[model samples]
Target: NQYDPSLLQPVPRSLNRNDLHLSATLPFQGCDIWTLYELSWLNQKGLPQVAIGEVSIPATSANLIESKSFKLYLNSYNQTRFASWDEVQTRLVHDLSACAGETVTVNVKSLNEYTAEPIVTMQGECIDDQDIEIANYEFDDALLQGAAQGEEVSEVLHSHLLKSNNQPDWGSVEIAYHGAKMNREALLRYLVSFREHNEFHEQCVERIFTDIMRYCQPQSLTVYARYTRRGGLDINPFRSSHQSAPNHNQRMARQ
Candidate 1:
């Protein structure tokens, strides 16, 4: 019930990036988009105000705020009174940026402002309806064979079948590429191969991006995944070769 920024815990990026073989110079550029669905605070008159919070943390940030810690930090605002929404936003931006070791973007939107926006689906051809037999559930990058053999063209494809061991955790992964055209069936199989994979949302997206770049050898590629909310927060990770970051705030129906 007290306003405390110290509740936030920061995890160094190198802790995981080292395992991914990512060095100081990263190959891709993007951000982790976090949506806070249960954000609330007290106004100057002791009236509670609710809003949706959108935070964009750059991939280059030295650290990432732990989800549980972030939730606790947000909860601290519940009984604390702020002079205005701008004051609240400024405090959030300052504290979050300090924790991440990079300038992060934060937006506080009213419920009406968020609800006015329509729920949109990912823009691309969904491969979930593909009639294909998935025998092996274990992750296999070899399933991507022949994916790059088709005529060269730029296109986007996506699948909602990506899942992890977490029962309630599922997401849609969209792959956009240019250069060598990818075989739809092969790509779909590769996506389905993650059914038994046990990894965090961020790692899953990065693995998909790395495998595609290695197996398909695309001239340019982007991998974005929007996972269903957990702990009142949903994480959308975006990685790309050309785009510096994701520009849209569209959320899938599942998110």
Candidate 2:
């Protein structure tokens, strides 16, 4: 009966925000982006319907609905009949917003409307110019600092020209060995130190963002990364301040 419409009525209790580990006081205005490929429901006439869609939930919510529970929540509609897709959309916005403790945005595309979107290449200048002194590479949070706050001095340093292709642009940092060979040698060495680094993908990105925020004390920052496992898996782990709240699901081919 897990999928039973009558019994599955969104089982909101099936998950909550706390389970997802969100700060009650968010440091940045961010959202959890979800791409659901297998979304289905019954039409008002009890006919089957299918769609693909994306969901964005703010981090300010009291809870970040667990993915499994969210899938279950969506599954609840499978046997449920809806008068229209708009009704389905409204219900999702309402229910998920409630579960998230904040407004949730959803966009769905019916089978025929699901476009076969193409991919694009990432572009960036290489940082591997001069010989980087790598005395330590084993997850040193210390390397995450920026210049010390002092009298503003507009000075510049000299460096040689570099080259590269599309590197795996992870949030603020980017790396890859495929098309772009950015500082191919130096970049590879610093990254290799993470071989034994046992941290979750999100944690690594967060650490990078954290180190930057503390050391660089930049006005703001964001870290996005894509990990591949069991084939190609994409997770957009992004963090940013309120200056850019409510990010759009519509990212350009270049971004």
Candidate 3:
């Protein structure tokens, strides 16, 4: 439960009844979904077990972000009893999927009990290492979700160029997820774009989820990222609609 950042006393935020759907509008209504891992399974024998799960978090549930309640909820399970990691993993998949009313995938696939390390790892290179330079490509505030642009005006974005020895480029964006709900199709759209760009992996991934939530409206969401290794240590960050997403349990070295 302590690992559940959701329980940490949240900073104060002003609340308003009318602000709830003020941002959702569209040529199309969009929703976001994400997966989380990082459940530790230890029984009385000191046997280690883990669980991983994916959930379809609706962007509408952004209100949940205000509560800081789900962390305590997850921690409640830590002290409770379970027959095996299998029991813990299966029940979570079924329950989370049911909660979202969509098919959800939950398992220990990202981790192995015997391995005892993070499965999904990420690494980034110094930004200057790119072999080529772009004539112009910097994210500006104009592209952010703001009303000044007006509604329904479509714009073409800077396209991505292929690079070799592919390592994530860091320092391009600030990425963090204290838990946010999202739209799945919107996330997929960004994922396609993220693959083509030259950004370091963490920023590339968090930006994808942020863009989706800013634009699409889903009931529940999960934002997950996996970056190919670059240095000696791969770092992974998890965010979601409710609580801190789970972690992959595999020992992978940074390339």
Candidate 4:
């Protein structure tokens, strides 16, 4: 139902509000955010159809590049024909859930995409508090020799040159691109002290993953950045902590 783009536009006094979650904010310089979403459905003709919505929000909205608005843009699709929002929602739920490993809820209220140039990185370390692997350690290599021999694998080393683990929750911090000779170290400390912030889901995850890869070239790496919630949509981004990412399904938001 495409509400009249030109109606008396009644801003309902105290209209109902639905919360969408895209929590990808942190104060970590190297932390990144990667989120993926699939918008697909079986058309009334029974033919399979699909559309993809990918977003890479930063932990902060300060550094991300300018791009098309996401949330409301997604809603615009509803104006067209489909079995129902329920069906539309069902497809979205299924696709995004598979992407994110969690249940996802589509916005049922408005069809306006929210817009902003999300900041992709931050100015501090990513893991503070030392509560757990607030950050994480993951590798997809069949043989974990690089981890044993040393992180550098086959002439691919980035700025993320530090590794440590406070275990049960093991994790590592590496830079993705050498921002500078010293910027690499700065990013590592940023990863360690990453603190509270707010941002979209997809970008936040990608930002963290990309930054790490730029600095730290590990045999493999995995990024799992989860955000709080806004408009009921909490997004988590994942990327292979792999030094090389190919068939990497890490950034897709099946959730």
RMSD of 2: 9.0
List, residue by residue over 184-222, the lDDT tens digit for candidate 1. 888888888888877777777878887888889999999
User: How well does each candidate superpose onto the true structure, as a TM-score?
Assistant: 0.93, 0.59, 0.34, 0.31
2 versus 3: better TM-score goes to: 2
Q: Which stretches of candidate 2 lie over 4 Å from their true place?
A: 2-25, 121-140, 143-207, 226-235, 245-255
lDDT-based ranking, best first?
Answer: 1, 2, 3, 4
Give the per-residue lDDT of model 3 (tens digit) for 43-157: 5465655554333333233221211143344454665566766766676555444444444445455444346554433232212233442333333322333312233322211
Per-model lDDT = 0.86, 0.49, 0.36, 0.34
Looking at model 4, which ten-residue stretch has the lowest summed lDDT? 9-18
Tens digits of lDDT, candidate 4, 60-171: 2233221122233344443445675466655545543433333433433221332342334322343233333334333222212122233333332222222222111112
Whole-structure CA lDDT of model 1: 0.86
Highest lDDT model number: 1
TM-score of 2: 0.59
Tens-place lDDT digits, model 2, residues 1-255? 223322212223213223334345545555556566668888989999898766776645656554445566667778888889898888777777777677988887786764675443223443435565667646544443333344433221111121111232222234211111122343334344554555444445444445445554544455444332111112344456433432334333323
Which RMSD does model 1 reach against the true structure? 1.6
The clash numbers for all candidates, in the given order, read: 0, 6, 31, 84
User: Which stretches in model 4 have alpha-carbon errors above 4 Å?
Assistant: 1-86, 90-188, 192-201, 241-255
* Cα deviation of 14, candidate 2, in Å: 19
* Model 4 TM: 0.31
